[PDB]
Structures are given as C-alpha cells and as structure tokens.
Amino acid sequence: MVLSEGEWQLVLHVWAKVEADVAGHGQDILIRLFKSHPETLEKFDRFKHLKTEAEMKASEDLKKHGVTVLTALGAILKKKGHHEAELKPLAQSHATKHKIPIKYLEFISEAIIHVLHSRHPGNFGADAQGAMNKALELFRKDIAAKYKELGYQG
Numbered sequence: 001m002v003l004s005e006g007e008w009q010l011v012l013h014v015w016a017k018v019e020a021d022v023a024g025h026g027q028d029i030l031i032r033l034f035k036s037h038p039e040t041l042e043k044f045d046r047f048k049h050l051k052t053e054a055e056m057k058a059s060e061d062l063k064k065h066g067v068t069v070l071t072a073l074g075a076i077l078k079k080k081g082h083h084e085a086e087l088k089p090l091a092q093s094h095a096t097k098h099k100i101p102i103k104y105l106e107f108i109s110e111a112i113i114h115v116l117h118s119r120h121p122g123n124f125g126a127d128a129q130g131a132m133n134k135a136l137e138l139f140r141k142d143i144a145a146k147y148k149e150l151g152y153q154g
C-alpha cells in the first residue's frame with residue numbers, strides 16, 4: 001500500500017505534538033495496551049509482575065521502555081514508507097526473540113489511536129485518524145511480510 005503526501009502530512013503533524021512529551025505518551029500507550037489486552041503483559045518478563053495501573057505508572061523501567069518504543073516508531077514514520085532498513089532489526093527481534101504475533105501489533109496500534117484521540121482531538125479528526133491508521137496498517141503489513149521471510153509469520 002502507498003500513502004499520499006497529504007496523508008503523511010497529517011501523520012507527521014500529530015506526531016510532532018506527541019514528540020513534545022515522548023515519555024508521557026509512551027506511558028499512556030503501554031498502560032492502555034496492558035489494561036485493554038492483559039495477555040500482552042505476559043510477553044514482558046520485566047513487567048509481568050505489575051498488578052495495577054498505579055504500579056505501572058510508578059515504574060521507571062516501563063516509562064523508559066515506552067520512550068524506546070515511540071522513538072523507534074517515530075523513526076519509521078518519518079521515513080514515509082522508505083523504512084526497509086529500520087524494519088529489519090525490529091522484525092528479527094520481535095519474531096525470533098520476543099515472539100510477538102501480528103495480532104498484538106494490532107492491539108498496540110489500537111492503543112496508539114486511542115491515546116492520540118484523547119490527547120489531541122483538534123489534530124486528530126477523522127481524516128487524520130484515517131491517515132494514522134493507514135500508516136500503521138502499512139507498518140503491520142511490511143512487518144508481517146518480514147516475519148514470513150524470517151520463518152515466523154506468527
């Protein structure tokens with residue numbers, strides 16, 4: 001699939017706002033993921049013990065990881081589709097080391113959309129959300145294709 005320049009502009013415009021507070025956005029997104037789909041928390045040996053949202057909010061380690069994740073996602077989005085290089089190491093670790101099914105990538109996509117919608121209503125109207133969804137679908141399709149090449153496609 002291919003996004004138009006106009007769609008990339010809507011994506012990068014809302015992402016510029018997210019970048020004003022990467023740590024806060026990372027926290028909100030991961031917590032949303034873990035609360036909505038608790039099964040995903042089981043994949044993290046380091047966070048598996050967190051029992052409540054309060055505990056999740058207080059975790060310095062979870063917050064640091066959220067920053068790592070958003071920074072990696074941000075680099076991919078800024079490539080505007082030309083992310084083959086950035087996708088390789090990411091797909092390898094998530095397929096082979098962490099073993100993350102595509103289904104879980106859909107869950108985090110939903111968490112990202114939910115948080116942008118709550119925090120940036122003025123910059124995340126219907127068109128902007130459509131563009132973000134298309135960007136994340138492209139991301140998932142390309143990761144799924146790499147998963148298959150690596151022997152996982154899980």
Ligand code: HEM
Nearest residue numbers: 040043044045046068069072073090093098100104105108
């Ligand atoms: C937009 C989606 C995603 C991005 C950009 C992303 C990015 C990253 C990055 C950059 C790291 C660091 C180095 C590495 O291991 O490759 C990481 C680690 C990891 N990721 Fe993701 N990830 C995503 C989604 C997921 C999902 C949905 C799951 C699980 C439900 C997952 C589970 C993990 C685990 C288990 C680790 C290692 C945590 C640790 O160091 O203890 N990832 N991810």
